[PDB]
Structures are given as C-alpha cells and as structure tokens.
Amino acid sequence: HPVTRTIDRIESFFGELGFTVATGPEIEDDYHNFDALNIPGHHPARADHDTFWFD
Amino acid sequence: ISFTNLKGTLHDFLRNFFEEDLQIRFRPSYFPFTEPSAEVDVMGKNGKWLEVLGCGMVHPNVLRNVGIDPEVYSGFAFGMGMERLTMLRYGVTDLRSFFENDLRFLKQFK
Amino acid sequence: LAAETIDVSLPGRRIENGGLHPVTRTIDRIESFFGELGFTVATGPEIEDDYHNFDALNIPGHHPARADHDTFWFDTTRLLRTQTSGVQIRTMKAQQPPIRIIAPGRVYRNDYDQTHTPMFHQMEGLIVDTNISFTNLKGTLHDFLRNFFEEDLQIRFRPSYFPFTEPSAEVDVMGKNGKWLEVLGCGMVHPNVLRNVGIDPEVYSGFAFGMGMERLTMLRYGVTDLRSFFENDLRFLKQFK
Amino acid sequence: MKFSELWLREWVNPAIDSDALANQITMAGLEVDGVEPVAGSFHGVVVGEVVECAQHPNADKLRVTKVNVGGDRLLDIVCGAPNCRQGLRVAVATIGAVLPGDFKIKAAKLRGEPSEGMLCSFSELGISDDHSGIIELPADAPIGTDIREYLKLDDNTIEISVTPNRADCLGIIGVARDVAVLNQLPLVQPEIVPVGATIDDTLPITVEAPEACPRYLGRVVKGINVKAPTPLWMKEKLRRCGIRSIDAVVDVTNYVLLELGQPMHAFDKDRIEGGIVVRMAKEGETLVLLDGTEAKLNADTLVIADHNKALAMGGIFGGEHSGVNDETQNVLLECAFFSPLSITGRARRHGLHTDASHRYERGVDPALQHKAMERATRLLIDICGGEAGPVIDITNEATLPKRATITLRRSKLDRLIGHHIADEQVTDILRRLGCEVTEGKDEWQAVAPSWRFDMEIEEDLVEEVARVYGYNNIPDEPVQASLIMGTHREADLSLKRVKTLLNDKGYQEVITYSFVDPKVQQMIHPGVEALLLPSPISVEMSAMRLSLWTGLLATVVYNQNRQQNRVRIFESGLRFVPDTQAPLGIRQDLMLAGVICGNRYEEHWNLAKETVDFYDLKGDLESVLDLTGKLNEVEFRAEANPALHPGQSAAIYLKGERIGFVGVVHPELERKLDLNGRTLVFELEWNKLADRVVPQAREISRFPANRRDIAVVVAENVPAADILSECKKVGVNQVVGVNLFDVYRGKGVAEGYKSLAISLILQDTSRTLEEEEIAATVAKCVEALKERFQASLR
Amino acid sequence: PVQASLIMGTHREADLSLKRVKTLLNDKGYQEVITYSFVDPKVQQMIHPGVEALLLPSPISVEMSAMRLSLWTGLLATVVYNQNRQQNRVRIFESGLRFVPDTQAPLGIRQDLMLAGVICGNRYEEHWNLAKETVDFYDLKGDLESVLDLTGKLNEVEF
Numbered sequence A: 001h002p003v004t005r006t007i008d009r010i011e012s013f014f015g016e017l018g019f020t021v022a023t024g025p026e027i028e029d030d031y032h033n034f035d036a037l038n039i040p041g042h043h044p045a046r047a048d049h050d051t052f053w054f055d
Numbered sequence B: 001i002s003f004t005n006l007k008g009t010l011h012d013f014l015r016n017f018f019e020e021d022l023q024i025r026f027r028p029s030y031f032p033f034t035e036p037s038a039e040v041d042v043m044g045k046n047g048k049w050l051e052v053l054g055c056g057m058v059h060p061n062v063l064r065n066v067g068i069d070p071e072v073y074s075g076f077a078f079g080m081g082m083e084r085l086t087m088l089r090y091g092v093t094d095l096r097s098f099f100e101n102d103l104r105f106l107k108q109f110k
Numbered sequence C: 001l002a003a004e005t006i007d008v009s010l011p012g013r014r015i016e017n018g019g020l021h022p023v024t025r026t027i028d029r030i031e032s033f034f035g036e037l038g039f040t041v042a043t044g045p046e047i048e049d050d051y052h053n054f055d056a057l058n059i060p061g062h063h064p065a066r067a068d069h070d071t072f073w074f075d076t077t078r079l080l081r082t083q084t085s086g087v088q089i090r091t092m093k094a095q096q097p098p099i100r101i102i103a104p105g106r107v108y109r110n111d112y113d114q115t116h117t118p119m120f121h122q123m124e125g126l127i128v129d130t131n132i133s134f135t136n137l138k139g140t141l142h143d144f145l146r147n148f149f150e151e152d153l154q155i156r157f158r159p160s161y162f163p164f165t166e167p168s169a170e171v172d173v174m175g176k177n178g179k180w181l182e183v184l185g186c187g188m189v190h191p192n193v194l195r196n197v198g199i200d201p202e203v204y205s206g207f208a209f210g211m212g213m214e215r216l217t218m219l220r221y222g223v224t225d226l227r228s229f230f231e232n233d234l235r236f237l238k239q240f241k
Numbered sequence D: 001m002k003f004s005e006l007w008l009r010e011w012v013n014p015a016i017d018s019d020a021l022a023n024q025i026t027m028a029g030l031e032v033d034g035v036e037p038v039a040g041s042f043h044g045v046v047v048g049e050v051v052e053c054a055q056h057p058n059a060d061k062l063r064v065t066k067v068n069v070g071g072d073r074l075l076d077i078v079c080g081a082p083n084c085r086q087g088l089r090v091a092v093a094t095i096g097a098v099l100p101g102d103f104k105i106k107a108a109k110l111r112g113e114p115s116e117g118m119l120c121s122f123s124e125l126g127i128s129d130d131h132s133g134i135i136e137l138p139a140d141a142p143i144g145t146d147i148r149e150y151l152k153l154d155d156n157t158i159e160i161s162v163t164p165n166r167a168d169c170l171g172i173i174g175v176a177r178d179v180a181v182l183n184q185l186p187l188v189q190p191e192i193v194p195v196g197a198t199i200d201d202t203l204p205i206t207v208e209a210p211e212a213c214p215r216y217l218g219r220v221v222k223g224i225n226v227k228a229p230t231p232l233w234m235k236e237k238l239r240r241c242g243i244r245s246i247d248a249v250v251d252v253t254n255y256v257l258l259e260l261g262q263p264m265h266a267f268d269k270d271r272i273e274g275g276i277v278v279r280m281a282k283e284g285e286t287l288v289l290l291d292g293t294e295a296k297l298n299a300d301t302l303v304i305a306d307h308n309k310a311l312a313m314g315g316i317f318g319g320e321h322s323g324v325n326d327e328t329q330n331v332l333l334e335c336a337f338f339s340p341l342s343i344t345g346r347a348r349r350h351g352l353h354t355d356a357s358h359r360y361e362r363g364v365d366p367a368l369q370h371k372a373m374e375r376a377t378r379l380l381i382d383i384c385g386g387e388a389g390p391v392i393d394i395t396n397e398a399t400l401p402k403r404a405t406i407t408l409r410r411s412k413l414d415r416l417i418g419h420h421i422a423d424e425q426v427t428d429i430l431r432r433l434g435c436e437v438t439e440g441k442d443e444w445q446a447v448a449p450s451w452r453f454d455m456e457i458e459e460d461l462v463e464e465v466a467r468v469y470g471y472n473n474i475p476d477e478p479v480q481a482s483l484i485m486g487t488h489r490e491a492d493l494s495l496k497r498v499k500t501l502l503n504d505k506g507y508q509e510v511i512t513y514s515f516v517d518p519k520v521q522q523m524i525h526p527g528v529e530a531l532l533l534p535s536p537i538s539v540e541m542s543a544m545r546l547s548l549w550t551g552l553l554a555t556v557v558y559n560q561n562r563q564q565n566r567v568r569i570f571e572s573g574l575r576f577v578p579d580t581q582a583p584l585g586i587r588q589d590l591m592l593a594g595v596i597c598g599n600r601y602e603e604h605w606n607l608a609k610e611t612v613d614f615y616d617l618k619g620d621l622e623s624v625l626d627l628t629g630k631l632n633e634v635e636f637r638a639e640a641n642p643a644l645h646p647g648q649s650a651a652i653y654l655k656g657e658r659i660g661f662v663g664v665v666h667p668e669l670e671r672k673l674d675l676n677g678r679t680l681v682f683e684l685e686w687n688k689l690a691d692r693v694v695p696q697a698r699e700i701s702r703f704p705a706n707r708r709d710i711a712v713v714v715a716e717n718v719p720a721a722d723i724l725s726e727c728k729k730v731g732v733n734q735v736v737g738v739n740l741f742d743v744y745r746g747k748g749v750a751e752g753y754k755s756l757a758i759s760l761i762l763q764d765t766s767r768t769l770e771e772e773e774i775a776a777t778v779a780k781c782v783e784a785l786k787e788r789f790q791a792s793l794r
Numbered sequence E: 001p002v003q004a005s006l007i008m009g010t011h012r013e014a015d016l017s018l019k020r021v022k023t024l025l026n027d028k029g030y031q032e033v034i035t036y037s038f039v040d041p042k043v044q045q046m047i048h049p050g051v052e053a054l055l056l057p058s059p060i061s062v063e064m065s066a067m068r069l070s071l072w073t074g075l076l077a078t079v080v081y082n083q084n085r086q087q088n089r090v091r092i093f094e095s096g097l098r099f100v101p102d103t104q105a106p107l108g109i110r111q112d113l114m115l116a117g118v119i120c121g122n123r124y125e126e127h128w129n130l131a132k133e134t135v136d137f138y139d140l141k142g143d144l145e146s147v148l149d150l151t152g153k154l155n156e157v158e159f
C-alpha cells in the first residue's frame, strides 16, 4: 500500500538513529488517550478532535 | 534535549523524505502536551506553504505523570499524517482513493 | 445442495521456499545491529594494491605481517585483499569526521585446513569522532556479543598487536567447552593511519574492529567443519531457511 | 476569527506590507486561514446625490433620475430599484468605469430614456449580496469623492485560527497587542470615557454562584429606539469581521465583542420579573432559546434567571422572549466574567456554538468588563438614544482569577531552547507581553497579565520568549545521545518479510476501514454481536470488524464492479471481538487475512486459464508458514465455518493451537455480495506465528540414501497428512524424507477408499543401509498405519 | 556507550536493495550459494573459451588458480556436487564480483558485482497434483522478469 511504503521509509530513517518501533491497540480508554496527555474532560480537545466514543 | 535538537532532527527528516534541499519554516502552535509547541511547513510547487508535521518539547506534566523528572530529563515529540505525506511525495490528488483500494491505483506502487 | 467435499490435508500447490547462505544471514544480522547505531555499509573491490591493503595501514614492505600474511599476490603491487581496508581508507579520504561505517566482504588467505579456508568473509567496523575512547570500544562490543548470541555471556578483553591500532585487543567468549574462544579483534585507530587520510589525531579519535563471519556462524548455529560452508551441499544449506 | 486589517492598523500600524503582516501574525502562533479583499476590484465609481427622481414614462418598474456627481452638469441615470427616492446619496458608476466581471459602463438607453451611468448596489460592487436595493449612504457623504476613499474599500479581511490557548487574541485589541510586541511598537487604544448616569432606575441583581460568575455588570438604558438604523461605519466593521448586521442593539454588542473580546447581551427590562438571578439551573429545568429550540438543562449549567423563570444560558446563548424585540423601549445590558470551567462543555452538550461561549470557555479578560460596558453604553446611546442608569457592580474579588507569579530561570531557558537569548532581550519581551518582571541573579520572576490564561508554569514563559525571538532564528543542532543497540531476537518473524512473500506470490496489499457495515458482517459471521458505534460517520461503517473478511470481500466487489474479475489481495490489521475477561471488554488481536479469485494467472500464451481452487490458497499459506520452520507441526482440519463451504474449509492448527481459517466462501454467501465466482479467503492470528525456529546444524550423512515407495489404501475420510506424520514419526532413526507423490481414486480401489503413493527416503550418518533393515523399517511403518488407520499395502 | 550525534544517512528511494532481490529469489524457489572466486581454468576455458583470465602465480591449487570471469563456473560446479549426491533438482543463485582484465579499469582488472543463477531438474518436487515436467527457458525468464519488475523498467527490456 502507498502509505505502508511511507511508514517503512520513515522507520528506516529513524531506525538509523536508535528509534525502536512500538505498537499498541486502537481501542483505548480515556486516560491513555486524553488524561495522561494533559487533556482533562472540560478541555475542548475531546471534541475538536471529533472522537468516536463507545462509552 | 532542546528546541535546537527538535529543529535539526526534523530538518534532516524532511530533506531525506523528499530528497530535496527544500525550504522549511517553524511556526508556533498549541498542543496540550507540548510547550513550546510548533508546526512545520514546506513550500510546494503551488507556491503556498503546506503543513505536514506537528512537534514540540514534551510538557512537564506528562513527564511527571509517568515517573520522569522534567528537571532531570527532557525531550521532544512529533506527529504526522502518512496520507498527507504520501500525497505530496507521489502526487496523489484525492485522499479518499487510498481506501477505495482500486487495483488500478495500487498497481502504481509496485 | 451439492457436496464437493475435498480433503484439505493434501499438500498445497506451491514451490518450496529457498533460503540464504548461513554467512549471509550472519552478515545481515550484524548490519541490522550496527544499522541502528548509524553505521553505513561500505563495499569495495576484492583486488587491491599494496597501498590500500598494507601501506596505508602502517604496514611497510619490511613488516612481517605481509609476506608472513598468507597473501595471494599477482604483481609486486596487485594482490587479493586480506582485509576490507581499501574501502575504509578511501572513505576517510573522501569525508571528514564523524565517520561510522561497517565494511563486509570476502578476504583471501593462503591456508586450507578444517579451521582455515583460502577465502572467507570478514566484517570490519569503524567509527571516528571527537571523544571516542577505549571504554566505548568495550561497551559497543559487549553490546554486540550479548545480542549476537542472545545471552549475557562471559567475555574478556586481552592485549594483542595490530599494526594499525594501539591500544590493540582481541576478545574471547567463554566457549561451551570451558576454555576461552577468540571471536574478534579491535583497537583504537593508530594516529599514523589517521594522518595519511587527512584526519588529525589531536582533534579526533576512533576505534575499529574485525571478525570472521564463518567463525561466529559456527558458534551461533553449531556448525562442525568450516568446509561445509563452501561445499554448498543443499542438504546443509536447507537448514538455514 | 475574522477582522479588518484597517481596523487592526487603527491600534498598531507597522511599516510593513499586508502579506508581511499576515506572515508576522502566523509566526506569532496565529495561523492565518486566508486573506481576502473586502470587495471586488473596480474603478470609476463615485459618490453622488439624486437631485430629481420621476416615474419612467414607458416602464412602470423603472425611474428616470438626474444625479449630481460634482461634475459640470447633472447626469441622467435610469434605475429600477424600489428604494430610489430624491433626497438620497447613492454610489454612481459613471461612464468609463468598469465593475467586477469587466462590466464597462457606457451610455445607453433603457426602455427609451437616456442613462449616463448606473446606480450601484452592494452586490454589484462585490461587497456582499444584499440586492434588495441600491446603496444608501449617510447624508454627510462627499459628492465628488471616490467610493474607495469614503468607504475605505482598500482593505483585507484576515481570517485566523486561534488555538484554545491565547484566549486574548479573539478580539481586535488582543491580536493588535501581540502584533505590537513583535514589532516592538506601542499600542494605540481608543479613548473610552465613561458616560455617567443621567437617570435613577436599576433592578436587584444577586448571583448565587460566585465561583461561576465572579463579576456581573448590569446597566439599564431607558427609552431607546430599537428600530434605529445602524451607521455604515459599524455595518462595514461588522461585515469585514464575519458578522452580519441585524438590529442596532445586537450590532452594538457584536461591535464591542469584536473590538474588546468581551461578550455582551441585552435583555428587555420590562419583561424581567423582580430582578436578575445569576444561578445554577435546576437539574431538568427547561429553557426556550432564541432559535425556538428548547433545552433541558443540567444542574451544571449556569443560567441568567429572574425571580420566576430562566432567561438565558449563562454566557452561551440568549433566550427567546427575554431578548430585545421590535416594540421594547428599555433594555438591560449584561456584561459579566464567567469562570471558563463553568462555561466549557455546556454549549456542546446542547449543540450550541456562539461568539460568547467560544470566548468564555477560553477566558475573557477579568479587568475588562467596565471598559466594555462604558463603550457599549456610549455606542448604544449615540445610535438609539436614551438615558443610562448607573452600573450595577456585583463583583466577588475572591473568586476572581489570580495573576500567577512565575519564576523563569536561566538554566531551564537555555536547556529547553538550546540557544542563548540575551537577558536584555528576555526582559523586554516579557514586559511588552504585559508581565511585571523582576530581574535577578540569572533569574526572572514575572506576573502574567490579566488577559492571559495560558501562563501558569515556567515552560509557558519559554514558549513566549522563543516565539517572539523567532523560531526561524533558532539554529539546528543534531541530538547527541547514546548509541545503544537494544534487544533483538532472531526467533522473531518480521511481518514485513511475510508481506514481502505475499507480494512475491502475486498478492496486493490493501487497507480497509476498521468499522464495517454490520449488514454484510452479519452475513459472514451470523449470530455474533459486534461492538457498535453510537453516532457514527455512517451506518455502513458503524460496526467494529471482528474479522478482516468483511472489508476484504467488500474490496473485491469494488474491483469486480470495475471489470476486474481476478483479485488477489491481503490485509493486516486488528480485529475487535468482545470478551468479558479482555481489557476494556474487547480483545484486539493483530490478524493477517487475504482473498483470491479469478484465474490462477492473467491471460498467458502458455498458462492454462483455470479457476483458482483450495490448494492454490493453501500453497500460499504453506509458503507463509514455511518461514517459521514449524511447517512439520501444522495441521489442516476440516471444521465448519458459516462463511465457508463445509466440504472445502480448513482450520489451521499449530501444535494444538488453531491459528486461523482457510477455505472457499460459502456458495450462498457468494450469491449475496454478487461475487463473480468462486473466491478463496483466509485469516491468521499474527501473534501466534510471529516466532520462528532458530536453526541448529546437524551432521550431514556422507553415505548414500535409499528410496522406497509404498501404496497405502485407506478410507476416503482419512486425512492424508496424518499418514505422512505417522511415517515420519515412527521412522526417526533412518527415515529422513516422507513425500506423497500420487493419490488415486477409481478403478482398482473400492468406492469410498483411496490409495496413497508415498515415497520414503532412508539414510544414516554412520553406515550404508541394506535391504535387511530397509524392509524392516518400511514394515515398521506399514504396521503403524494398520494400527491407527486400519490401512494396508497394495 | 558512545556519545555521538544522531544524524540521518543518505537515503535514495530509487535504490533497489540486493537483499530485496535475494529475498524474491528465495520466494521463487531459489537457494543462495557461495563459491570461491578462483576456479579451475580448464573448466572455465570450456565455458568461456578464448577469454584469458587473471591467474594466480602461486595458488593453493591449480584447480583454484583463475579469477572467475563469471559465476557460472562455480555455480555449475556446485550443481554437479549436489547431483553426485542424489539431488537431481537444484535451483541456486549467487551474488559476487567477476574479474575481467581491462586496461581502462583500475589496476588493469575490472571487478563488477554480478548476480547469477542456475536451475535444473523438474519444475517442482514430486507433488500429488503437479506433473513432472523438466524446467525450460520460459521458467527461468519468468523468474528474471519478476526480478526486473522490481525496477519498474520491465517495459523497457528486450530479449
């Protein structure tokens, strides 16, 4: 896919600098997606991002 | 880790990504997890600037909330959309054609 | 309606996968280790002159490690290289520090035993910066050996001699037999080497290292005889798919 | 945020071009979205006064007029606008002029009578699109003057995107204040003099939520003219800032909102029962907004109520009947400061987004309400007339926001930036930004001004020093860090290597959306409830995929609709299967799935045009699994899958663990989705096969080998792979190769039975084998096949 | 650990990796082999007749005395080795330099990096659904067109 070519290129760019690739889930809670990033519940980033909320 | 490090790393990255000694500007922005924050632009053949990167020095409240001391350690972060950087690199017009998955479109990237 | 029931356990319609030579697998591993450290990979010709293989490495014509080097010669100048040095000598002349390269390739010596072959592969690394120290040589090599064998094993640095390094050293890993086993050589680059390539040893320093690929492949995958690598028995190579 | 440039230059006019000003605003953290002119380009249009207006003698719609433009004579103009009187000052496009669209003005006859020009409208000049009539200029309009000098139409409306920080930059003063510090020029502020009350009336105003509304200023204005016309200078200043002209009262509140950033509101005093109560709404209290829609408010929402009912949502939106209508004469001006945490979220909770809520939830200057109240009162009186009562001040100095006292150390400054900025240049920048800076030994201690809400820690001052010093003037320095290798595991299998193999086998990688149509997914996986998306982008993308087949098959249909029958594609991604014991009630495993169809190859002069079958896909999967070196430990068992043909489906097991499926889509499911023919699909759990066997060398025999063939007849239901695994497990001392080379079903074997032709290769490392032990080892395998499968030898 | 700058290297997207080509051959049924650079001139002179190659004055053996002009001498020598051990079907390749005397090249000898291979025997091993057919010209060209297709220049290739 044309975007995986891009990701593999960028990984080889930062691979030569000591950047280890890390992966994780796509369904996250509110702490790991907002709270731990200094985005509280009253911050508009929870709505200006336009987020899909399950609960 | 300083702002001078953040500029030098992304300047190396953008020039090696487009294989061209291109013009790049840093302009301030906002992200709740960086301070100072910035957005990185490049000038395409259309004459106007094109934002591609967001970056900034990691906010001390984030380093705090994980177990890192901002007085001892520092560091920058950055983020970028791959579809936007793919369109500029290969000349893709409509962004929706990435997920239509037309084989006539994917065959061009062998 | 119809039951076109087949047996799904029959072998599929395919052609069996091929593999790489065990030396190539080892070479690609070490490149991937030093690739994540900024080490570019360099290649060069296998036929060199006496300058790029001897003289530029502080080895004059009278030096013993030359005639007593088991070297293949053509004229009094041309020879089959005994080390991937002509590609590192040429790189240091083309650019100033910082340098950070590894130079794999084939080398040739004149012995042929169970432990020696007339041709074999050699991986030689090189880094030249401002504050390169002997403590860095120990760190980047203990890091390599711990990752190549995937084990926190016993290593030791032992004084040695190389005409192009001082301090010089060879390293050993605790062999599976109780004795030590020489793995690779290394040392801080000699100031005379930096001098004739346009680098001042007062401003910059560096270290180089070298290792045999057949050596580390026999230790890693438990290969008995060294002639098995170049006999190219398909039953032998099919074990490293 | 839209604003006029000429309005901005009334506060600060640096000696630079407009685009040089725009890029200067961009470099200050205010990205400009666009710079647009206020009107179309044209020349030759001038002010003028109609001197005589009479009925057109041959056109009931038209009017024959004579207009003076300060020339030698009066011009005859024909116009068909309804607002064409005689005491009017209009905009006249004389002969020789040209309008937008290269509309040259030439003398001509209109239905008989002569016309030496044209009376213009706002649409005809590219200003707006108010085509209700022609332009009505103030009576003070200079006759001979060009319209661009009188209306200042050589102006640009700058549009900027203001982040949630920099709440001060939502007014002309805020943006002009920051433009001043970049050019180091003083800020010119208009003289805002208080008006001084001339009457006595007021009304009781009590706030029961001081933490939400620290300050509330009320002022009654008795006897105003609601229907008074808004002056043209104010209609243009509002229009050049993205705000239309409505009524003279709301245009004043919108003018002060844009000029000072202070939201303001106007109630009808005669519809206010008792007084004003700034309180938290009762949980469940309803309120009718101005747009007619009702809102069942929460106890969290602050409201402006009277002694009986609720009148508006505090600082968000005004009510329907509490506002100014067309027959009111006495109004009450609200100008307050609301705590941003008391306003944020409440507007989006009810789908509202106003000029007020957007500014209150970011923070308005708490030292600003009085200055804005006095300007609104003066501008309201000089437009609508009337007498203003005293200002009602209800301020709680305790719950007001405190200006933070931050210390900025030289240590962190050059550590976070990496570039030395002179201390003379640091102290000036902080002072010009409005900080009370106290210099010290390698340190500063500044107090953030009242209008800034993003200055609370030491790092916030670093961003301010750096963005004024200029990001484009800070040098680059490569990171000097450690060179450490990290953890590598040779036993790992790269996903990129597997995709490479599929690329070399004729597969194209695709990427499909994670949310899929649950209608199609229910046809593929019936009876399994999926995680659904409330309020999705679409109903055909409102179900988290539990397998990659829904997107894969949807992709082959997309390509089969474009005359492309043969599709060989694969995808890697996460599936989302609900599970109680999984984190967040959903287990997300990385899956590898693909699908093939059409002929085995494209049309070729020497390759047979045959449809792909089951063993074509398995051969691709055995090539994938061969990378792990555990292909000897893989078993394919026929297990039922509702999406797959029951007789040609297989579960893929690895040493007892089922790692996925492979088979042809069920012909009934194939009839749906209108697949053009037989299609093969598979799916694999990646984390189960992402580990490969590290090789270990074994001694090669220097002695020759011996091959023996056997013909084994078994029942047709007996899997052939289990016979091969029995020949290789029984013979381990000598049997190094077991390969099946022929399968026979037909004449010679009874129906329901089949004969397998199996070749055994025998070899030892120490000697050469002879027929004594060769036939003995072969008989050892023949008997093992008769004890487990009741097999035989033919 | 070494303290040094984190500067990226020279990357050219237009480059094709020899590892990418070796991997593709592995997926087409090819096994990598490595042979010696010096070969037997008597065997090389019947593969490349009349082509004088660079000889070693004092070699380890006369059978290992001539720097190879092509990889076919070592490849075909490996085929006979495996065929003499009951392996009729071999599909191997090798990457390495060739040594051709050129007075215009450095040191009077030109050393270009080659990529050579050789296949024989049946197309597949004995399979229950594949017919025993010996490999022909269009099988090897097909693998070459797959290698050349990695460059995006196959439309500009003639045979």
Ligand SMILES: C1=C(CCNCc2ccccc2)CCCC1
Pocket: A037, B031, B033, B034, B054, B055, B056, B058, B062, B077, B078, B079, B080
């Ligand atoms: C978590 C993260 C991830 C947030 N997204 C990255 C990003 C940074 C800067 C600009 C744009 C995007 C940031 C650092 C602390 C831990």
Ligand SMILES: C1=C(CCNCc2ccccc2)CCCC1
Pocket: C057, C083, C084, C085, C088, C089, C124, C125, C126, C162, C164, C165, C184, C185, C186, C187, C189, C190, C193, C208, C209, C210, C211
């Ligand atoms: C060194 C070299 C030549 C040999 N390669 C390194 C080595 C070191 C110790 C043992 C074996 C090999 C290239 C120029 C700079 C100094």
